[PDB]
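Box 3.1. Reading complex inputs
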Amino acid sequence: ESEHFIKCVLQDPIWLLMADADSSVMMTYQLPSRNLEAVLKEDREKLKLLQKLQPRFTESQKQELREVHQWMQTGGLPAAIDV
Amino acid sequence: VNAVHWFRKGLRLHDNPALKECIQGADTIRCVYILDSSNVGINRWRFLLQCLEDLDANLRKLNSRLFVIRGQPADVFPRLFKEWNITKLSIEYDSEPFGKERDAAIKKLATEAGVEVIVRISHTLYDLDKIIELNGGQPPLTYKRFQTLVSKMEPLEMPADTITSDVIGKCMTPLSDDHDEKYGVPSLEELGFDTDGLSSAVWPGGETEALTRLERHLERKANSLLASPTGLSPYLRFGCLSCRLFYFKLTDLYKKVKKNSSPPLSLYGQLLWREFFYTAATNNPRFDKMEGNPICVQIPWDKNPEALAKWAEGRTGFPWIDAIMTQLRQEGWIHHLARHAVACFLTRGDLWISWEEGMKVFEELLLDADWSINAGSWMWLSCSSFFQQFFHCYCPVGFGRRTDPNGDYIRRYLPVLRGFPAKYIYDPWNAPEGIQKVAKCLIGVNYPKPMVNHAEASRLNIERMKQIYQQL
């Protein structure tokens, strides 16, 4: 009854609130061209902090992966990434 | 003595060991559903409300009614214990991290209020913890070891007999009048949803529809990306169809057509794959995140909120990806190959956006996106975890070109491009300026431009992921 603002509202999705889909962005926006060696070198630094946060497995968990992933058996790169 | 069964993820009356155990000798019973987020997520809530109305219709046949209540369970049940003098509280076991701490807190409120709690397993085939103990206290990292474990267990028991006239047995449901408008099932418009332009339900929720689709699905067992009339994945997630009943009717039908009492695990591939992510996430409170996840590779994704908006809303410029998101937004379901197509476009193929962002988009639109299954899939589709062997990324244009060259799926959900021919329906940006005017659709005005060049973006991200795994 005396609930002050009572007309409930359903807000937009998260991706529409966090971002701002310009009516031009919904048509014109295009991702910018990137420098390959520049984006790779910057990822090397950020991967250095994300080094001991990487997944660490035990004895049984490694042999559990080798029966599925050949790159765990060989030590190279996965078949999908190697292109 | 009074009793109350809490419905959450088991909106059905068949194979309900939690519900049937509560009505064994209780004098009173009452089925309660506690209903406590955006605009596009309407097919998700429309599915839920259809299941509750179906659950109430099947309860009406037993001179009972469903009790829908608003609010939080930590605030609702403490007053329902005293206002109804409740002694027994039965719930279906929830193995998900948030569900376990919610159940453990509610039963702590009930045990100190003199209420006994009944817990039964019905949403999963096996006891997930019993599978973890066989592996050595840790859930299996791969689907291969998981299949080896499920064959190392005793066979399942038959599903609990359905609640009927005798299961009740002089057990009155105290449906007093004034029940409607208080404990009734609200509509979409009562939740604040705009249903003026809403179409008819492509996936009608409910227990009756699940058993109907199950019968026709099994009848057709003894290419197209559209919604199949025999789909069961949304009803398995919402609990309208029990996986144990799906299991036994799959076994029994397989023994009849064949003569082999050892069915291969490919027969239950839909259930075991579903059961796998439930086991992999029950002991991982950070399974839906990358940082702090013990089984997720740390990847420095790019933070582009505006690019995520173009992808989620279906305005990327690629008619293949845009047609998948428009079907996902309108129908609430897309094919599994379509899920692999849009996941690569967002994660390890083009946009290089975190899989967590794509997880929350499917969380609102995809009807069969359970917290365990939807989180684990995005890690595998982005090569962030190792549940199953990886696969090459899908080129957006040259993928659906051979599924149908005319672009019938493209013109189906993208009517703005209904005037383009097969040589430009998948690549409208490579179309001449003259053919764009004759179709009443100019690229950049009526239809978005390609938000990224697939040639450079692919080789960009392939080299970035090479640097990641070579560093691991």
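In summary: Chain B touches chain A through 75 residues (CB under 8 Å).
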